[PDB]
Amino acid sequence: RPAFCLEPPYAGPGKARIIRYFYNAAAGAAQAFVYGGARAKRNNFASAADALAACAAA
Amino acid sequence: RPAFCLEPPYAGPGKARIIRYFYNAAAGAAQAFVYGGARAKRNNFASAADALAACAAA
Amino acid sequence: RPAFCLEPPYAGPGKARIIRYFYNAAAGAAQAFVYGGARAKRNNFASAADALAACAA
Amino acid sequence: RPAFCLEPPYAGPGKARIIRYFYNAAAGAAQAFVYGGARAKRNNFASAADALAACA
């Protein structure tokens, strides 16, 4: 599993209101968070399917 | 809940661009993903309603 | 299936960034939206399973 | 509603595989489509809720 899959989600300072997904490796699942549209970090996916494709596999 | 309902959605190797649905157990929701047309895995349904009927119940 | 189940989601005027779910009657599915914390309408649930239950799905 | 709410979805010339949402005014519903990542038209949203906020 790539290291970035262990990052906590980062909303950032932006004024957009976007639901994104991060992989929660402790829970073994993708989880939704609200992203502000600026200064994205790596564990930040458009969809749960995308988060799982990158990060679900051991 | 059937175990397959916890399997990540699989795009597969095909070149098609088909909208399918999978059960996201962390959210308890059936959500969209892009399927390539080949080698479908189990958590892959033609509609959100279909995925929920198969997988939402405890 | 209650009448509120036909409503589109309502973020409202608040500044919060709360993930909530609404029932999408056309699809028979539960989908997420960003609720601002104020003036919620009825098609607004803390989880997708809550929305599906309320709207008899 | 905005006139763009009547557009059919536009996948565009791109090769990416991105789920996006358009408002289908004939169905009264926001529906998913595959967007290629380039030359988006206006009836193109990252979520069903955003399509409904603009067009419902």
Side-chain angles (χ1 to χ4, degrees), chain A, chain B residues 1-14 16-38 40-58, chain C residues 1-38 40 42-57, chain D residues 1-14 16-38 40-56:
Chain A
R1 179 173 298 109
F4 76 88
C5 303
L6 301 183
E7 296 174 352
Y10 183 66
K15 289 189 69 91
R17 293 163 164 268
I18 311 156
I19 293 165
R20 296 286 183 86
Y21 288 81
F22 75 100
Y23 186 74
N24 184 341
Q31 182 179 313
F33 71 108
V34 184
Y35 171 56
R39 310 291 302 276
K41 293 188 193 296
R42 283 180 282 277
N43 196 3
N44 177 341
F45 293 93
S47 73
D50 286 353
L52 295 168
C55 290
Chain B
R1 172 172 310 101
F4 72 79
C5 298
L6 308 185
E7 194 175 83
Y10 183 70
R17 291 159 178 267
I18 305 172
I19 304 285
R20 293 284 174 83
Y21 294 82
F22 77 106
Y23 189 64
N24 176 351
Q31 305 182 324
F33 78 101
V34 184
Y35 170 56
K41 288 192 185 308
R42 289 174 282 180
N43 198 356
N44 174 332
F45 298 86
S47 75
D50 285 356
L52 291 169
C55 288
Chain C
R1 175 166 293 127
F4 62 77
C5 299
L6 311 180
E7 295 170 353
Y10 185 69
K15 289 223 173 260
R17 298 166 165 254
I18 303 160
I19 297 173
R20 291 293 173 78
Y21 289 82
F22 68 104
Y23 179 76
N24 170 343
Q31 293 178 112
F33 73 102
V34 183
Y35 174 52
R42 291 219 46 190
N43 196 4
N44 173 326
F45 297 92
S47 76
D50 286 1
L52 293 164
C55 291
Chain D
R1 81 191 6 125
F4 70 66
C5 299
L6 295 178
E7 294 171 353
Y10 184 68
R17 290 166 180 267
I18 303 161
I19 298 287
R20 298 287 181 79
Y21 301 81
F22 75 101
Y23 188 70
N24 182 342
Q31 297 179 338
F33 70 104
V34 185
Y35 171 55
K41 296 193 185 301
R42 293 170 179 86
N43 194 10
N44 173 326
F45 298 96
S47 66
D50 279 6
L52 296 168
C55 288

